[PDB]
Structure formats: structure tokens, C-alpha cells
Design an enzyme around this catalytic site. Structure first.
Site, short mmCIF file in Angstrom:
data_model
loop_
_atom_site.label_atom_id
_atom_site.label_comp_id
_atom_site.label_asym_id
_atom_site.label_seq_id
_atom_site.Cartn_x
_atom_site.Cartn_y
_atom_site.Cartn_z
N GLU A 99 8.86 -5.08 4.86
CA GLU A 99 8.96 -4.15 5.82
C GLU A 99 8.68 -4.84 7.25
O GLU A 99 9.21 -4.73 8.24
CB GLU A 99 8.30 -3.10 5.63
CG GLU A 99 8.12 -2.06 6.89
CD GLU A 99 7.13 -0.95 6.61
OE1 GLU A 99 7.11 -0.11 5.61
OE2 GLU A 99 5.77 -1.07 7.48
N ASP A 102 13.73 -1.65 0.99
CA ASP A 102 13.88 -1.25 2.26
C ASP A 102 13.62 -2.53 2.99
O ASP A 102 14.19 -2.87 4.13
CB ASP A 102 13.02 0.01 2.86
CG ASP A 102 11.48 -0.40 2.58
OD1 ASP A 102 11.00 -1.03 1.82
OD2 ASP A 102 10.63 0.39 3.61
#
Length: 310
Positions: free
Chosen positions: A30, A87
């Protein structure tokens, strides 16, 4: 700009690591992906190449083309957890796609294509009649339930992927992810939690294993929704909940099962997401010493989301 320079000064190491200085100085996909996106946005190719070079050389999982999600520099093995975080992989691949456009170098797009193909092959499954992206390759596929994180449904990245490659599959994932998110929401706020359990018949609830809060993961959902489409009807519960509080007295989280709210309020990057969600005018961000890694990142991602509405 100045915000980006201050961000690198506080959080970027000379080897290309972004440091979560509030969470034991660790690095994660991330953080690398966020910073790579912001490096493109600030037209900072040296920083982008440093961030990407460290990410690729240190965190690449060669068995599937994704990335080990966390790097702990004080640990005996800094990459103990061998799982990915979907993600983070997405943000990295999205930043690479945007880097190709910014600097007109197809090598960044060729790198992106490998990661997006890996995401479809290893993290996207058919479940409850829809295509869904798992939070990681392992650990989230319980037999008749999947543990999902709707803040990993990075809608603006998926749209960018579809314009480049595997258009039908990415478009279907976006369609299914918007539809699933539209079915989520609990308690009087009708908001989703950080983690959501999806049963094989389509029934969803906040996942058993985590506090059932809309908190530091879920707050990215209105960011990604507004980034992709500020007119989206999926923004409705977010606007309604935030509109029910004073701007400076909005709880930082809500338990969507019990309706209990945080006794402290959104500030900094969280407040920037609130302003974005409600369309309240805000000026370019400033990174103060009171911002941690997380707040500093959100402040700039909110600004980028606004800029991409051009």
C-alpha cells in the site's frame, strides 16, 4: 510541490522504502503503491524509479508475480508473511500504468500488464454468482464464506486497467464490485465495515474476525468512489452519514453493528476524505508535523482524486 517534498523527507528512505513511522517504521505494498502514484502525479521520475526498484527487487513474489505485502526492517526475517495484499498490488500496477503515460515509456506498462494479469489469475474468483477480488491469495477463502475488504475494490484503478488490457474481465469485476458494495451496509449508518464476510448465497455481514467498524480501511471507499465517479449513487450513505455531523466533530470510526462511534474526530487525511465526499472546497494539502504516514498519504490522494476529475 511542497507537500510531496515534505512527504519524501519524512517518509521516504534513500533505498526507496516508504516508512510507516507510526507502525514501527515498516513498509508495505500500500505504501509503495501510494507513493508511486504520488511520484507520477508530481512528475518525479527519479523517486518513482527508486520506489519501484525497491518494491520489485525486495517484495516480488516470483511464484505468482504479486508482492509480499509487508517489510519489517527490524525483524529477523523482514518478509516473514509471504502473502500479498491485493490493494497494494493493484496500486503498484496502477501507478506503473500511469507512469507509462506520464513519461512515455512502454516498459512501465509492460510491468503493469504482468501484475494485472496476475491479479486476475490468482486473486479473482467466482463466488455467490459474481467475480470478486480476494484481499490476498491465501487466508481469505473460507469454504462457504469469503472474507473481503471492500476498500480493496479500487474502482479507478480497475477502470484504468480495462482501458489497457483484459477489458471484459476488468469491466465485469468493476460491475460486480459496485453491485456487491451496493448490497453492503449495516446499522443505522448503512455503512460497510473494514472487513465483510460474503457467504456463498450472497448474504453479507461484517466479518467475524475483526472489529466491525467503518474505520481506517473502509474510509478509503468514498475516496475511490469519488475518484472514479463523484456522481455515483454508491456515495449516498457516505454523504448522509458525514452530513449528520459537524465537519470538525465527525467520529473517526463507527461500529456498524452496534452504532457505537469513536469518541474522537476526523482530522488531517481522514478529514480530507470527508471534504472530498461532501464536495466541500479544499485547497492543496499541506503536510504538517502532526500528520503521520497515513494522514499525509490520504491528504495527497484526495488532492490527486480531485485533479483526476479533469
Amino acid at each position: 510541490d511542497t507537500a510531496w517534498e515534505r512527504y519524501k523527507a519524512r517518509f521516504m528512505m534513500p533505498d526507496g522504502r516508504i516508512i510507516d513511522t507510526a507502525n514501527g517504521n515498516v513498509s508495505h505494498t500500500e505504501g509503495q503503491g501510494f507513493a508511486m502514484l504520488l511520484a507520477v502525479a508530481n512528475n518525479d521520475r527519479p523517486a518513482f524509479d527508486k520506489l519501484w526498484q525497491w518494491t520489485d527487487s525486495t517484495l516480488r513474489d516470483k511464484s505468482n508475480g504479486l508482492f509480499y505485502w509487508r517489510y519489517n526492517p527490524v525483524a529477523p526475517d523482514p518478509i516473514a508473511d509471504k502473502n500479498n495484499a491485493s490493494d497494494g498490488d493493484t496500486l503498484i500496477a496502477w501507478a506503473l500504468l500511469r507512469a507509462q503515460k506520464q513519461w512515455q515509456d512502454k516498459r512501465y506498462a509492460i510491468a503493469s500488464d504482468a501484475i494485472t494479469a496476475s491479479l486476475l489469475k490468482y486473486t479473482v474468483v467466482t463466488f455467490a454468482g459474481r467475480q470478486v477480488m480476494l484481499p490476498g491469495v491465501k487466508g481469505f477463502n473460507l469454504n462457504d464464506h469469503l472474507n473481503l475488504n471492500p476498500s480493496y475494490f479500487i474502482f479507478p484503478a480497475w477502470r484504468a486497467f480495462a482501458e489497457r488490457t483484459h477489458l471484459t474481465a476488468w469491466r465485469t469485476l468493476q460491475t460486480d464490485g459496485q453491485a456487491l458494495l451496493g448490497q453492503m451496509g449495516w446499522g443505522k449508518s448503512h455503512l460497510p465495515s473494514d472487513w465483510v464476510a460474503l457467504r456463498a448465497d450472497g448474504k453479507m455481514l461484517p466479518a467475524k474476525e475483526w472489529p466491525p467498524r467503518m474505520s481506517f480501511d473502509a474510509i478509503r471507499i468514498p475516496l475511490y468512489l469519488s475518484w472514479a465517479d463523484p456522481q455515483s449513487a454508491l456515495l449516498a450513505p457516505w454523504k448522509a452519514w458525514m452530513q449528520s455531523y459537524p465537519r470538525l466533530q465527525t467520529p473517526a470510526w463507527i461500529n456498524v453493528s452496534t452504532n457505537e462511534v469513536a469518541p474522537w474526530y476526523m482530522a488531517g487525511g481522514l478529514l480530507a476524505v470527508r471534504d472530498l465526499t461532501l464536495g466541500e472546497p479544499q485547497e492543496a494539502p499541506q503536510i504538517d508535523d502532526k500528520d503521520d504516514y497515513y494522514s499525509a498519504s490520504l491528504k495527497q490522494l484526495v488532492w490527486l482524486a480531485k485533479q483526476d476529475q479533469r
